[model samples]
Target chain A: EEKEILWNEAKAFIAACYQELGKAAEVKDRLADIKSEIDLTGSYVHTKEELEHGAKMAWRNSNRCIGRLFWNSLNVIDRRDVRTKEEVRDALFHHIETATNNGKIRPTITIFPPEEKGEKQVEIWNHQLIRYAGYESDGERIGDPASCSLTAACEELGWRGERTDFDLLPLIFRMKGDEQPVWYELPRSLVIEVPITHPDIEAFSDLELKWYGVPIISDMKLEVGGIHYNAAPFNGWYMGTEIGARNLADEKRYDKLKKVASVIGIAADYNTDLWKDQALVELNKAVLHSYKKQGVSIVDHHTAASQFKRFEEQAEEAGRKLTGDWTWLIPPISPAATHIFHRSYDNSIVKPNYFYQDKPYE
Target chain B: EEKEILWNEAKAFIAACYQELGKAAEVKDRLADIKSEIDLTGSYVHTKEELEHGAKMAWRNSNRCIGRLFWNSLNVIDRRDVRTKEEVRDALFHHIETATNNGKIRPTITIFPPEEKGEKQVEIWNHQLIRYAGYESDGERIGDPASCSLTAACEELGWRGERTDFDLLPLIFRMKGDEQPVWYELPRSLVIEVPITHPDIEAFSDLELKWYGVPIISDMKLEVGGIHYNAAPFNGWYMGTEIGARNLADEKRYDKLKKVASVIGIAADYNTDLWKDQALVELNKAVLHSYKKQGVSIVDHHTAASQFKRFEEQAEEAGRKLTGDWTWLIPPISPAATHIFHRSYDNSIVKPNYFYQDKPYE
Candidate 1:
């Protein structure tokens, strides 16, 4: 029996990719080569050019991302040759410095070795390259609750932080068949962060809220054609609401709405006071303001939504059908205020695309 | 050969309804009558008990409604016996009066004659029993843009309005096979309303915003056990955000966010200022405060969401699978502030349910 290399997935991806590149004449030839390679090796390889455009196509086909307007501009770094743990760590560090670009965040991905015969050669354990550590004191979580479990796992591996709201975590990874994970501290100089402060609310800065600038997702599989890059890390610039509305404002996370409301002097019961709603807007404004003041790349919800509209229009012009996850695409604050809310999106699966992979730590 | 009175739908609904009512033995018996009635007459008559429970079940099965916690308490007014134009208009007015309840709004529905063989016995042209009218003056709509097309249709029928932002439209409908629509003005005495005013903002009342107390939807079909109530107008008390965040704040509707923002003294660019978001919360606050002050029934988004949780809990307790349209279940302003935004709802359709019908004026 043939391994589940599934020639159809490769055929569909090759046709779309080559046709999109206007090298339509080579599509059939590529498929014939892919079939020959797959039938014998139970897998196939993507060319250097295929890898670059394939990564961009995966970004374009990602239904959950609202920032796909710049999908064509994604900088793909091929680092599949790096195998040793230290080499992998440094390559990730390089991705951070190059993509951060002193806050003009270039959407980027660094792909490592592909999974062969349903096995990963390298694994990245961090949810993102830049993430704050979480620590519990008594009954309270000092930092992000989202990172608490991962933080504990890191502690088991003998990593430590200063127990602050903004303690950056170290990069954790493992090689194939390794019993223990290897971890490395990120160079503090390469990681850019913005201090959170409301322009109109003077007391906001006193809360000491801060977040890392870049959002480099480090633990997902990027499937282009029939191949899966098991340790592929990628990122787009932050949408303001991701930090202000979710990271800081989510009750399970920083839970700062009530604190912000109290500082703004309207800390009444939120049932109808809409204090949470008000704080949400103010916090997002602070995030946008702080990022802009420090020259960091960020976009407000409305601007991001407009860019998504342009993405849709361009896809429609290219005669490409668009698909999206409405739940993820719509911003958290004032969602109905955007055009995306009034419409329904076809949440169909498209490839090449990014897909969730199992946790290496687990 | 047979009209699409799908017996499978009737069978499914009967089993669920009877099982829920603890009359599991009657499920087959009830379905038997439905089959015979459908196979011979192409339709079936709902018993008074079935009509009542069926309406409540339709509300419970409504994917778009977040206020389904009180589905069982729905007041179903049977007006299927009434057959004249004035009688139909009077029935709709009665729905308004009963549901309004002098601002202590009640969840109510009035079922007119059902459609037979794909044709309605009575056609209701109005979107809702108590909707405000819109008139375009020099390319500016003075009222709700959502109502503009319907208002024009009413105008085409030789009906006129005073052209205010809150001018209530007349109830427009027609009996079977009528050449023209019959329009009747809603009695202002029966139509309860609340003056919009913010709890803390003194300038809020100066905008002169007002909205009807009850939202009695008129142009929809109530599908139950192979029968279709084409004029089953229903109401639930106002949800604050429905008025403040959508009807008034949407750019294509009343478009009041900028006006409200200007009144509140933040009329600059809104990209990062979050002026629109601020205005949305403040507007919603006013809606809630005003309704509470006037001794009216209204649920703030938080309260409504909590009630929706209860609906889900009760459904789960009863071993019933819940379905909902997440887009509609989530409030317009600050959706991420609610638990519904954090979760996904299966939007798969279930019978019996309320469904959109073609406009009679079209």
Candidate 2:
């Protein structure tokens, strides 16, 4: 029966959830009620407390995230009732502004209604709420290569933007089973961007790199029990290397290492000169410095690694076996200098976690 | 019947070895004789050419090594006929002198006789041919923490050193399964040590760091066909990070990041100043700069990764399936900047390769 099918996923998560919340006595009652609901409607709704804690558990079990230390302190806003395109847009804007909090980024998530009968009710086309637009020119790609596909998708759907390295892409999303996604420009006042400048290298400022204050992942599906929150958008504070070492320095991205090296008086021939390494250090340093001085919340790799160590310890204390993606756990710059590189992690997927979904536009 | 047992381990390597050497027709003939020989004596010998080529193949199959680009150019010194402790000592010394070559390092290996009747014929008790003696002090330790166990074993065998941080340990070995291992001191003239100094930071030279010119791994068993060369020591030029970031800067090793940070005037509080990373860059820069200036052959991580990329291309061109340990392929510092970090490798074990043996003393 479909009851048993839903119960299969339902039981594991309910048992795990109640056991972790130290309310094992309530598991049997909750499971029985959930089973009955699933039998009648082929679905079950999460309670207020259940939805809140489940989101935290989802964060806690995110193997690929480096900033899961504050999972329990996550600000989960239940927007399950917001069903219109305008409501979804407003909630996302509120999420960005509230999470940004004038530079002190807050870890947040606003979960939309879950998929029913294996159909997504709402979906987001944008990869992130605040991402730069990519413009393809004659031969050379102007902005982020990672964003080019999504930017093209948005453009095909009638979205336009200024051609610049740091133009904030408009939010492209759909709501209430809409066959087509809508594009809405995020007001410039809602987004906070910190300009990059090296603390010691004055010439670094001339290159002009800028990164958004908070990373608001908009497309990932938030799973709780058997439910999939298709339009659940989440945000976490930035780790400096995410922008400095990857977004700006990656060959497929900005590919600015050559310029950075030349600015520092290292005529880089691209190998063995330690030019790349030098530029990475300075760029990452500039990120932390700029963000901190500009009052935007950001963590350096060392502090993040140290925080991850605490997360491992805390999870152990809570009787949880830690699973992690080692590649994501290790920082991009000076990986061996960090403790996470020396350790191994179990890459097992756990329930009640964020998982990737198909793009709404593409 | 026993011939089949030896042939099981034998066929895989012989076929793989001869096929790669472009002598597929010879594999059948070689296998037939090896079967007959193993039937009579329970084991067979690898011919001089086969052994040399097999040694190169073993290096080619080493998953954890970053310097596999020059695998075919390996100098394999066959000392299979040398059976005495003194003979083993002289051969090892010759290997050090020849491989070091006054700092212009050569990738070389010295192979001893294979195991007979499942018994080791000769074994090296030391971890490396040239390693510093570790001293456990009064609640304090000196020298390489990695060598402490072997150092204790040597001291337990009545060997002593100057008790300084850089005192080269004596060679410890046992021949023909002797009841006890013997120790012999390596002459200072035979070993080349380079004093480390930062090209830009003068205070870094004040740290008085010095490292051996070449890294000689002394205790792994080399397996070819069905034969196990129980005493095979190999040498390769150092990768800058192997010393600067790990051996010198790892918390459990020299733990010198703090000192290095202080020398660079960073005044490290151990978190988020990127002091460790900055120090790593300088230390690694010093390694490459000092080694090149001193004429000691060493490769930076960038050049090594570039060469590895070529190695991958060349191996593919040669119709070989490449396998590698990704964790070891990625450098300790500025890992993402390199091409290796973006790609993945199959970690499947390949034969005609090096294998670890149980420590003689431990």
Candidate 3:
């Protein structure tokens, strides 16, 4: 009744890392230790080098990631020892500040303790570390519509804030066995945001649309070797479309395009996609311009596509077939205009990889 | 050894059709005949009922088709007994005239013979039986850029065509052993076309953009069970965006949006997506309006999406899971607005389906 799959995964990952690191001698010893540990405990610990390489490999194996050209260069912060809610909050704030790097954003992952037999696993309820607050009253929603449920949950936890699109939600986390959760308000200085403004349209500035500099996805599990890092959060610099094409443009989110379109004199109607399309373009341009103006590292879709093509070529040259989810890799706006849409991809799930976990709050 | 795969496919398909047709008595007899035929000749003939249901099943199982709701209503014309290029040419023209139904546009398929041992199969060189001609010169393409190679092949066959976006390429087909393909210029009287015109913009009509009534895709193979119908061309009414969003608006196709945008007085600049987006909207609107004006039975994407949703619901109620390729089912324009984009589908290729075959010309 030994966990052969877990043992095999550890061996395979360790061998790959050793081969890449040119420390082939350590693989056999590490693999033997992994086998012994997995047989008794059901899970084994990753060393700092293993954790670092594993994090990068997780990003590399991420089917949705278009920015995997820098897979080997991700800054992996080993915080596996952190257990309490206070530790989690402090580490997350540190991750945001350090990864932001004053707009020269660095791709980063902060790893927390993995789940084990008869032990409580730490869970973060928020989809992302930095998201706007939303409140519902009298059949109307104020702030980001995407965050209404999470905002309601936070309010239920005795949290109160102004119901605005820019109000940053407090970090909410709890251990598996805990009946209560802890919430910590993020410091203003640590959370960097960019105010959206179109370069050509002066009236666009009045809409007051803004988005956070870093995109720290907190709800996904990071599976490496035999272990599931339940509290691992990752971040990468925004591809302008993430905010402009989706966050601001989607009808279910901020839904800011109609207002922007009206300001630009485009008529809104069900019969025409012109207003929505035109508004989306202006909003996207504003995002790209604002980020560049603020010296923030945000890539346009065109550049991201070119980089992805290079990544594909480099992966092929290195004798590795790059696996990708075509749906996720293609940017929402003007997907056909990008090179990614023309090609087919093999959507194989490889480990170590980021994976969807059961909703911590729900 | 016998062609077991082919025999199995025939048996399975015949069984399904017999069950659907409420003729269980014929299933065992037909399956036995299929096995015997496969063992002796490496191929089997399908009964008229089997052929009809198989054609409907192929359409129903077509992963990319959004018009599968009416799969059972497909007018399947069985021409499996025919041979020679002359027969195919006549049949194709007949298919066009009949499928057009004088602008009502019936969903139809004219299934030809499948490949067999030492027997030649029919091959159509064109992607569609009807397409425009393109002439390439000085790194510039005149006419539909999508049709350059097909146009060149037609020219090689001693067919002359005008070098314009609207000029239809002659139908090119051949039996497998034939040294050259035969060409037939489609008569303008038999082809139903819609003149492009936007509701709000009078200048849009001057662009002279037009598309055929039926999209009879000729390149794909019709896979029914194990047999491959290499020359089964089928047609469905256009979903508007297929012409406007892709054919007319795609950079590699007609690429008429820039002219339309300029006429509409939208600024053409790399910095803003407004012009492209605005032009695409008008172009799509024009397509829908023009088709409606001409009394052609074309479905707008919104209507198609709702129909697809109904198809999904009906399939579920009938205890049949409908498989689909999300990329194809979702409209090319304003995809997110459609419910199809929001849901994921199992892309497993079911039996009795249409499949892409190797290009006959290339």
Candidate 4:
């Protein structure tokens, strides 16, 4: 989908590594080495290793073009709250957690390079937590703690010992959205803990498509310190705060959406569900257009508003119970429970709300 | 593929918390309420000032999973490598850097959880020189920093900032792989991070799939302290280590590989690269099969070893250059009189050897 730049670069590198040796078969294999592999999403491989000319030639080549693109996303947003390492970690966790969950009530991620001013300092570290495991449905399981990953852990929780993969980027996901739209609790996927450095330009060369680990979805948000960033839908097309701002023509909305966009990349309804076939193709094109223009994915903003209304309604319903005040029921119910609500602008009044009222007392 | 467990646990939660209210649709149109939207991946909408319920909600949920996962990964390895907040930050940085570039040689990321011996000891809070920019390869021209993203610069350096989306995954490929065999340096596209927790659970549910900022090859062998393990490919997979074991069958190799394998997941390849899907689908099926029997993903040791030779070859090629002599090839004469040869395995057969080759330097 990304123009297949990395794989081509890998091919070129493989070609160069074995050029003088004149082994056509090896050359052909090098080209085919990574081409044949595929992911569940139909992604392809990019490299291979072979010994030639008395040297164990590896196929390492830099994709400066793509590298620069990846690097640009790291632009950080200096926040007053980010005062210490813990604060930094907290901020990263917040950004990633929300992004991973493709719900509407989350903040998108925005990164800023560290700056040193007198006694203060801020810097960019790799593999920040972008999502959490939450309930996509009433019975959906959360991220397998057995599956949540060490790389992701390091990104969220600071390290303790000396030897460790400080910035490992493992795939992370979470539960997002309410179950009002029937599939509200249905889990969407988002890639979390994206490494600052692209392994495409790392020390090891001979390799192909490598997925650090498999990502999982949860039924409800996994709470941390009373927070729920890594909730649902941390997979699929995501956007950062900076990109979100750029997508908005109006600065007022951009300002607000920037925060949301920074932490979340709207999961494109392309890869999964019935949208898997033609939907993905269309969605992919739309996204490509937006990406090319440095614009945010322009969904039916009004539709989004409607979805938000449902959420607001739920929150109000739940709020009413807690506050004992009849308030606006715009979205749905926050305090009320239901069969997990998902958003579909196409639908208006779909089903009755059911709330997961079992709250844990800390 | 994991079995889609349609759990409906959050049904009530979604209903009460969302659908019961009428704001669902209304909230979608207004990004103004997004500040408080802090779910795992930050995909929610509430009041911008609703930091407590909005932002904190996402934060808590995300961290619950993130923090636990961090601890869990280390728990499996039974190490204290990433025990402190600072260490975790460092590890995060390391992952970002490594994922971005595969240099002469790269080290697999190793991290362990913290010991609950919370004794607030004073630690040095420092920052590094990080570049704050994201680039778009196909969309813009080179040397055009404006065309790049400010986000990239932030993530590479390390920062105390805020971000909301998991937009960084696609951004990983935007980085350059300045190294070779393309072994250490991975193509931006082929990179995927696997979050392997419970070293024994071979199914993907508990894993995370993230792309690297830089493309690092996947088929690398596990080396601990400069020694390759004989059964390195059997037990499981990890970031990278030096001096490890080889394959299985051979008692010596099995002994060593088993040690490391105990720490990380065995090679996804099982043993041979020639298996159907390099032994992924087959091995995973086999693993799942065994999981039914033993509640784990372990197959016969020899079966795994025989299926993962390609990885060994890749490791052998990349490892030799980094170790053995501490010597690497000097870059060819360039316009800029520089000694740092950016060429990697995929480039000019300039292997990744590292006994710290001392040039004619003072």
TM-score of each: 0.94, 0.97, 0.84, 0.16
Candidate that scores best on TM-score: 2
| DockQ, all models | 0.77, 0.76, 0.25, 0.01
Q: Model 2 misses residue B43 by how many Å?
A: 0.8
A best-first ranking of the candidates according to their DockQ comes to 1, 2, 3, 4
lDDT of 1: 0.87
How well is each residue in A1-362 modelled by candidate 4, as lDDT tens digits? 43264345445545654553455558786556456542132333222122111111110011101111122122223343344444444444554445434332232223222111111133222222332221112553333222234333333443322222222333322111221111011122433222221112232111111111112222222111111212221112332211221222122211122222222233223111111111111222222233323322222222333433554465356442111111111111110111112212222211111112221111
- Sorted on lDDT, best first, the list reads 1, 2, 3, 4
Q: List the residue pairs that clash in candidate 2.
A: none
Off by over 4 Å in 4: A1-304, A307-362, B1-109, B112-116, B120-362
The residue-by-residue lDDT of candidate 4 on B1-362, one tens digit each, is 01111112122223222332444554433433332332222333222222112212221122111111121121111113333444533443454454333321232232222111221111111111121122445664222132133344433434222232123312111111222111022223433322222223454332222111222221122222111211100112221100011111112212222222332444423211111111221222222232324322222222222222332244366442211110111110010011111112222212111111111111
lDDT of 2 by residue, B4-30 (tens): 666898888888878877899999989
What DockQ does model 1 achieve? 0.77
Mark the regions of model 1 whose C-alpha exceeds 4 Å error after superposition.
A1-11, A25-44, A136-138, B1-19, B22-44, B137-140
With a 3 Å backbone cut-off (N, CA, C), the pairs that clash in candidate 3 are: none
Residue lDDT tens for model 1, B1-362: 44454676677777877887798998777878888887887777777888899999999999999999999999999988997887887788778887888877889999988877668899888888888998887876688788888999999989898898888999888889798888998888988889999888899888999998888888989998767788889999889998999888888888888889978888658687878788888899899999999999999998899999999999999888999998789888888888998899999998889999777554
User: Native contacts recovered, in order, as a fraction for each?
Assistant: 0.81, 0.77, 0.14, 0.00
Error of 1 at B182 (Å): 1.4
Residue-by-residue lDDT tens digits, candidate 1, A102-167: 989899999899988768899888999999988886886787788887888899999888898788
TM-score of 1: 0.94
- When 1 and 3 are scored with lDDT, the better candidate is 1
- Among incorrect, acceptable, medium and high, the docking class of model 1 is medium
